[model samples]
Target: ETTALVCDNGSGLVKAGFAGDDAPRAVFPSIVGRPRHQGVMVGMGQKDSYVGDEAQSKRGILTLKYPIEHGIITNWDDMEKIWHHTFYNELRVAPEEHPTLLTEAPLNPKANREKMTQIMFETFNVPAMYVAIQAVLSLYASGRTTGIVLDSGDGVTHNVPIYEGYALPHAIMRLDLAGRDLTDYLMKILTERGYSFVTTAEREIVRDIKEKLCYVALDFENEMATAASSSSLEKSYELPDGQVITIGNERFRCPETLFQPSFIGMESAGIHETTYNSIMKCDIDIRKDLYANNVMSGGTTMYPGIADRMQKEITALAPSTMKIKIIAPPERKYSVWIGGSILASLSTFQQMWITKQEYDEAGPSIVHRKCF
Candidate 1:
């Protein structure tokens, strides 16, 4: 039986797999690596390139290049290599044999989508392809057609309101504050505490530390007081070299930037205010619906206590008589991929895909009319 491939290609990671799978069969970093040495030597070769975890693991021997920056593809050559590696080597699949479903960021440039369509048909030779907004796909993951989607991924965070499966572009809100910003904040905290990470590999260590230790504080002032008054707030993390480092209020402070961007000198409103403001931009009749069905996705929102804090914040900003419910899926980090998987498997959704034949007749511009 023929299967459709679903890919959620983000600035931070690329997740790909066949439709109907519970999760992505392949998940890797969006970075690609080329060897520093120009000739073959033992386990290294000049022509050899690495993608994802392998590239990350061999950062010491190779110069790293990221295909995407700030949630947009900036290096098509590296991106093609990453996609080729994802399909041919990692998943052991031929692109020509399967239809593909890809997710793009909300408000993605039309030029980018056209280029994506052109590449899929001309380069990969895929039979059919469909590109959906990441926010819409994330809404589908939660089995909802209408709601406010708050997606905080690696490079950026977006608040998109969906009504009957269509994203309201005018009401969409974006933030430069996200996972990378938090990671940088964590590194800064470590640096100020007299700790230093001297290698590129240590960046990954800091990320891991952030994921394992950082959390949102519902009561920031109280938490800071407790952390300041006692050593109990500090937690020791051992480095790859076995040196242990202690972290204090930095744990909550790092993730706190999501709710309070001012802490990082950013002038934008927090996620809650952004969500409320986004909803207010929509039709008044739909505001309650959007608030009641608010859905949270993406990697950054997975931090502990985020849902509770968001609910509290949004509720406080909402009307006294209105109710706010924020639904955060347990698999939120991979929600877009899972949503694509769910969407691609639907028989009805099959008709929505833009076939290669259609592309041949209408060209890349057909994507705007056919897929959307």
Candidate 2:
């Protein structure tokens, strides 16, 4: 009956905590910054320089590396360093004492899933472990067994349709624009206004402005017209260094990339369009169910007024005779982890884990069979 730990390696963050917790115990950047040198490397090679945020804090002095990019684990050694940091430092738990539930992206490679299972059993000696797709977990987190999961994170936006707890692979749609891209786009527009206070080195400053000040406009054209005619719509934000910057149309303009990719100089479809595309690709019998149980997940979906805008746009695409509902939770950013937390805590879920004995006997290649 010991607790299970949940870890979600989101594109921009590594979220880790016990499964039953309402929120993550520790959330930090997924990047690992090491010394610029390997042979007689820089002093950052110190034994105590933990992964996650510690390595990131010494940014300029160290060479930063991302183990996972676009939902794929590109480097195994770097990911192991991340896992070691999670179990040893972040979660502060002995791996052998707790079962674990990890989230994976859709369409992840077979080799990758097997590799992770082997490490959990052979290296960490966890009593039991299970890996599930992120979108499916997020759908359940919003309290839905069947729904279209609109998961927009730091690096990508995905619309995955789930039916009876299974993801419909043929209908999944993804967009490359995300939270991080919004920051760069925000910077792009500000430069046109002749503002030079924030540079590439001050990237964090722009991100802060976006999270704290940016919002989606319920009425885009109306808001844009009002902002153009009235300076009263502008907001003044003070930087950490006591510098003040004025935010005008940039506030709405920044988040508009989700609705209008043209702002970022891209010809790509927005979240609303891609989501509609995904739903239409699904079976006709379940299309209406997908609309009714639509769930929003991931960090980028947290912006105020987005859910309403999404419902309005997505509904229009259906062209009458359909109901559109966007199920949103206050803790949408942690949807995948929250779903895992809720599931792994159930008494029945204990049977879902692949025990160490199972792995020892069935072999590491057994993850796909057991996990599915």
Candidate 3:
């Protein structure tokens, strides 16, 4: 079984997967662009140069709207154009006979849901399609049907549960803490440290550094002692010119935000606490199944100590006699895609698709029936 097309829309990106194991067929920023000039050029190769600092260079280049905010598409009109262009130009998916799979947020607005189905079936003339929750897709990719899904992305921490590939939305929990929020906190800290280029370029540099060096601290006291005792762990990052800046003990510090957000003047909530709260949202019978099968997927999971920390913390937080395990995919980043791929490979998965006829007759309820 080979899926002709698959789409994964995360808070940060929109990825399209195709049949076979060639990595996802395509990926694009889930963003829309409006040219400042009526005749301005907009295409794949030119977009990178026209965005961010480069766009700021030209008075009338392009202005981008990242429509998928906090994992939900807000505007359909602008987004649809970008999606069509990206799919055609980047992935080269033809208009006919292409089976499509689309990943959407949990609890998407009904209007947005209808709009998505309409755009795919009527506008794009897609032949067949499957709609799935991104978290559920990640869980499927992780090969766990009974586990809590922790999806930490740009805007929020989405804690979802998977009960036999179906999500228990009642168990869903969200914390307003995520990568972007932490980036803002990091920028503030950098300002206090007297590194004043908190604009776009400097922020990118800081983010790159943070990704490279940040790690969760298992024992805060011991980590602080180690940092204090060894100056060698500190390193400097070069700025655009000859300027070099040192970010020593501060490199691994951001992970502390998970445990104590107030360290950055925000409220505090540990991942363990959030996990416990999320689990409690489920029925007691289902809650008992949340032990060793706990599935974790997210960019944050790339943090070196995250799995161990989550496992230890979740164990202590669960019922005293309950066992706990935090499982991660070999490539945690591609978990969603892997799930979609697996779903595509199933013999009966194609039966889960909503065809053009179904959309025309039943409308977007096709998505609810097929996806849910």
Candidate 4:
């Protein structure tokens, strides 16, 4: 039918697919929770809409539940009902009209994979489905089908390689370094500066500030020098209450986390070093091919000077002869969704889909293999 439903367990993501166009209709947090007491509540973030810090406020009032954790759907008991309601409410994905395309983490736990597939058939009664990894989908959308996707998300940073839309598990590497760690680090910084900004009461506001103002510093020393030289550092950020929160030109500083994480006492590896390590983990025969086809797509890539900064670091790390390029999707956030869209458009996508009848015969195992 040329209509595909795409979803990701990682966050609140449920989108409808159309041929030729590579984007989804809606995206939400991959969370579902119940009100304390008698019954569970179903909503996005916080109960109160106008709270200054949405994530933090929501975290307090809403019994937070994440379907996916550290890239896998680990919490499935209470999560299933949430998924069912969310799917029906958001996508209107009736089993009769449209088949589905779902994305999960690469090399997911076998148990988790089987559980997800089982839920789709038993709970939602979907007619057909095709499951694939989110990173692979992103690579496909990039049109490279073969390249290294460095995905930096709230939980972790993963470097996964793909060869013609197929993932290379051996070459994949993940680290505990990512957006969450960055936020924690920023909170610590704010605390030490005599600012009471780390409390969950204000965590959302702090996180928003970090994302909006923080960035990778290309020349750390020079950038810091400029910040130090400028007299009006603290005049940068404005508080929501019309108050000015000035802090030098150094308002943009998170990029340093990717390059020099050890500075924060977190024994960490830089993105460039980790990327090379991941490549080396692959078979030597494919090193040449994978290197030439390296692709970068993720939220972190949207940071100012990220492409230039990453290029500089990798070039200095690798031989001058090796070529490295960073490609950014027009809607950086939808890169993986676009990949899902393209996969749905494939002529053979229907074959990849498991029908309700097949679900009955093969059961969860079919869902596990295809989706996982």
Best candidate (score: lDDT): 1
The regions of model 4 sitting more than 4 angstroms off are: 12-20, 32-67, 164-167, 198-201, 230-235, 248-252, 263-266, 283-285
lDDT score, candidate 4, position 248: 48
Model 1 over residues 14-113: C-alpha lDDT tens digits?
9999999889999988888877755555655434887888888877777777787667788888889888988998889999889999877766677888
lDDT of 2 by residue, 144-256 (tens): 78999988888778888988866688998877788888988887788876766353335656877899889999879989999977587788999766978888988888898
Angstrom error of the Cα, residue 23, model 4: value is 1.9
lDDT of each: 0.86, 0.82, 0.69, 0.66
Clashing pairs in 3: none
- Candidate 3 or 4, higher TM-score? 3
- The TM-score values for the models, in the order shown, are 0.94, 0.88, 0.84, 0.82
Stretches > 4 Å off in candidate 3? 31-65, 75-78, 164-166, 229-232, 240-242, 263-268
Worst 10 residues of 2 by lDDT: 41-50
Tens-digit lDDT string for candidate 3 (157-270): 777887765677777877767776666666766765688755444555566667777778787767778888657667777765678877756666677787677776766577
Q: Model 4: per-residue lDDT, tens digit, 41-145? A: 555454422211232344554444555566666667656654554466555556556677776665556777677778777777777877777678777777776
- Rank by TM-score (best first): 1, 2, 3, 4
Model 3 Cα shift for residue 11 (angstroms): 1.6
In model 3, state the lDDT of residue 76: 66
Candidate 3 TM-score over all chains jointly: 0.84
